[PDB]
């Protein structure tokens, strides 16, 4: 699965992305639907943005979990809530001290137009 | 909504993204469809790219607007058209003096696997 | 079409993205389905990520081809295979030598909510 994050760089230090990944990876693997050698978490920092009217110090974090097609809505609905909870908890200190917007979405890769070649599965398995 | 821009860094200065965001944010909100507190506009700069044949000084801007599921196709169509007119107008002096490709598409976020926590609503509302 | 890559920067020079793009652009064009003036290839470098367990020096390359809607699944399939064959070949040497994960998916743009303005078609034509 692909866990992609976009984060305004005004919160880059405090967001602690390494620490969220450190938690996210294992949490998804633990569900048993997702293989740990397949989990790929990364962030794209943003230096130029405009949230709302740009009149305050606004910060945002947008997250996408792209997964293989086939899991049931129910199974996705539940891994989502579970992961949203973890995310919420990771950013709680921040949400209480500054203006912050959190958004998380789950999408599926194309059922057949999907290609992969990954040698780390060998390490695990 | 999420207004996500990808821009080649050869026009990073002349493109004036901050200036585009200053006009897009208020035009989305005035449509009466998107709450100001929810608009997050951002650019991701690209330093390595190849357009066509890589034979000239090509520049490009790719824009995606991701919105919540549920607006009627006709709403979305008329909003995309009025936004595109503003965009073109914004880039008109560049379209005039150099090689530029503008592309814009509107995408819906998944209808139920969409999670959020935004405290800036409390400021507007 | 849009060929978007996300690359972990631990293989930033070894990956030779300019080299992959140099091959990718002409092979999309040689199909007769994708106009040269229209192919935009670019990479988003990632400086913060976690693959798997974060235990070793893992690298990952994720690629998305986004094309306008309406092509048969069968053409998309043959363009997908043909191009995964060339990606595999481009990184075969890194693969032999290190932990690496290659992923590639083909996605379509909305059939109608797509807007564009490109003055480079003029050079072609």
From Swiss-Prot, chains A, B, C:
Optimum pH is 7.6. One of its GO terms (biological process) is catabolic process. The active site is at residue 1. It holds the Pfam family CHMI. Keywords: Aromatic hydrocarbons catabolism, Isomerase. Its EC number is 5.3.3.10. It catalyses: (2E,4Z)-5-hydroxypenta-2,4-diene-1,2,5-tricarboxylate = (3E,5R)-5-carboxy-2-oxohept-3-enedioate. It comes from the Bacteria. The keyword Glycoprotein does not apply. Gene3D superfamilies: Macrophage Migration Inhibitory Factor. Pathway: Aromatic compound metabolism; 4-hydroxyphenylacetate degradation; pyruvate and succinate semialdehyde from 4-hydroxyphenylacetate: step 4/7. GO terms for molecular function: 5-carboxymethyl-2-hydroxymuconate delta-isomerase activity. Transforms 5-carboxymethyl-2-hydroxy-muconic acid (CHM) into 5-oxo-pent-3-ene-1,2,5-tricarboxylic acid (OPET). PANTHER family: 4-HYDROXYPHENYLACETATE CATABOLISM PROTEIN (PTHR37950:SF1). Homotrimer. This is 5-carboxymethyl-2-hydroxymuconate Delta-isomerase. It comes from Escherichia coli. The gene is hpcD.
